[PDB]
Structure formats: structure tokens, C-alpha cells
Amino acid sequence: SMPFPKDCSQAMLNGDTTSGLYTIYLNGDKAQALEVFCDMTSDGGGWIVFLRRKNGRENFYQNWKAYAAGFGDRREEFWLGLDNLNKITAQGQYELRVDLRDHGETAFAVYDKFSVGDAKTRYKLKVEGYSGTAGDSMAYHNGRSFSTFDKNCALSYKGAFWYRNCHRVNLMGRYGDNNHSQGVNWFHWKGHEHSIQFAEMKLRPSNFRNL
Numbered sequence: 001s002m003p004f005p006k007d008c009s010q011a012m013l014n015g016d017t018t019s020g021l022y023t024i025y026l027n028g029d030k031a032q033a034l035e036v037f038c039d040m041t042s043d044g045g046g047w048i049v050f051l052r053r054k055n056g057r058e059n060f061y062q063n064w065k066a067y068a069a070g071f072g073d074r075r076e077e078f079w080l081g082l083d084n085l086n087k088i089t090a091q092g093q094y095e096l097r098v099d100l101r102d103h104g105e106t107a108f109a110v111y112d113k114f115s116v117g118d119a120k121t122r123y124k125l126k127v128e129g130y131s132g133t134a135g136d137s138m139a140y141h142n143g144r145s146f147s148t149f150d151k152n153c154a155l156s157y158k159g160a161f162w163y164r165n166c167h168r169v170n171l172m173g174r175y176g177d178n179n180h181s182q183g184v185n186w187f188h189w190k191g192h193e194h195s196i197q198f199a200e201m202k203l204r205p206s207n208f209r210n211l
């Protein structure tokens with residue numbers, strides 16, 4: 001086992017194949033402990049989950065400081081934090097996976113390259129190298145800074161995202177809201193008038209598939 005695993009891939013290869021809460025250590029530093037939910041089952045596992053929508057109990061209409069730091073219950077609905085995502089994605093080359101499920105239907109998207117810049121970039125999104133079944137709805141968002149109501153699409157749709165003008169992906173939108181562009185949307189799967197029941201965003205090293 002690795003004493004200070006830096007992500008869910010290093011925590012897994014530590015043998016632990018059960019999805020749930022694990023401690024990772026940013027940059028392998030024992031003073032940078034971070035509790036994460038690891039999805040150890042989806043496409044070989046080793047995923048840090050950083051967003052989960054599943055029941056609408058948690059409020060995602062939250063401010064810049066909340067999106068920077070993270071909020072919610074890692075076992076239920078939560079957002080891991082942009083500062084955490086920046087620090088994780090700085091560690092090496094990460095891939096993004098998005099898992100969606102609505103009324104029994106599933107879809108996914110994988111982006112071979114995924115990074116989140118630091119606060120001086122307003123946590124700029126990089127997403128490249130799409131594959132999947134959900135449809136490439138993050139391409140629209142590539143290179144965009146993060147937006148909250150207090151730093152306007154976030155206000156206008158009551159969510160938070162790497163908004164452009166405004167979105168094809170709104171996974172931090174209003175739960176169960178089927179009004180145009182208000183809900184948990186992935187446009188190229190279910191459009192703008194269908195709020196998705198279940199959504200997870202997760203990351204792991206892009207080289208995991210052959211390590």
C-alpha cells in the first residue's frame with residue numbers, strides 16, 4: 001500500500017476495492033489530508049467523485065467561497081470544491097468521467113484531459129478528448145472560468161458552473177426543475193427541459209487504463 005495516496009487510483013491499488021470514503025493526500029503530503037468519496041466500481045474504479053446529484057436534498061445555489069471550498073455530504077449530494085479540484089488536477093494528467101441516470105436510462109461521458117486552474121484563473125476548465133454516450137456537452141464549456149451568482153448565468157439559472165452564454169451542462173442546477181435551462185441538464189442527452197435524477201462527476205489519472 002501507499003502511505004499517502006494522492007487520489008482514488010493510488011488508494012485503490014492499495015487493494016481497497018469498496019466504493020466509499022477514503023483519505024487522500026494532495027501532492028502525497030501527509031499535511032494535506034482530504035476525505036473523498038472513491039467510486040471503485042465504474043470502468044475499473046479509482047475515481048474521486050467531486051459532484052453527486054441524486055435527491056435534491058442539498059442546495060447547489062451557493063456562493064463563490066462555497067464552490068471554492070466544497071459543501072455537502074460526500075455520501076449523498078456534495079461538491080468537492082474548486083480549490084481541491086485544482087490541487088488534484090495539478091498532480092498529473094487526469095481524465096473526467098460523468099455518469100448520468102434518469103428513469104432507468106444511463107449515459108456517460110469521458111474526457112481524456114481534465115484540469116481546473118487556480119483561483120487567479122477563476123478555476124478555468126480544461127476538458128478535451130471526449131468519448132461516451134451522453135454526447136459531448138462539455139466541449140461548449142471548455143476554457144471557461146467558473147461562475148457563481150456573486151462572481152450572469154449563475155443568477156439567471158440559479159446554479160453554478162463554468163458558464164459561457166449560458167450552458168449545455170448544468171449539473172449544479174436546480175433539482176427536479178424541468179423549466180428550460182433551470183435543472184440538472186446535459187443538453188446533448190436530455191435537452192434543456194429535462195432535469196436529470198442522478199449525476200456524478202469524477203476524476204482519476206488518464207493513464208489508469210493501462211498502469
Ligand SMILES: O=C(CN1CCCC1)Nc1ccc(F)cc1
Pocket residue numbers: 069070071072073074078079080081
Ligand atoms: O464539510 C464541510 C464543512 N466544514 C469544512 C471542513 C469540515 C467542516 N465542507 C465540505 C463538504 C463536502 C465536501 F465534499 C467538501 C467540503
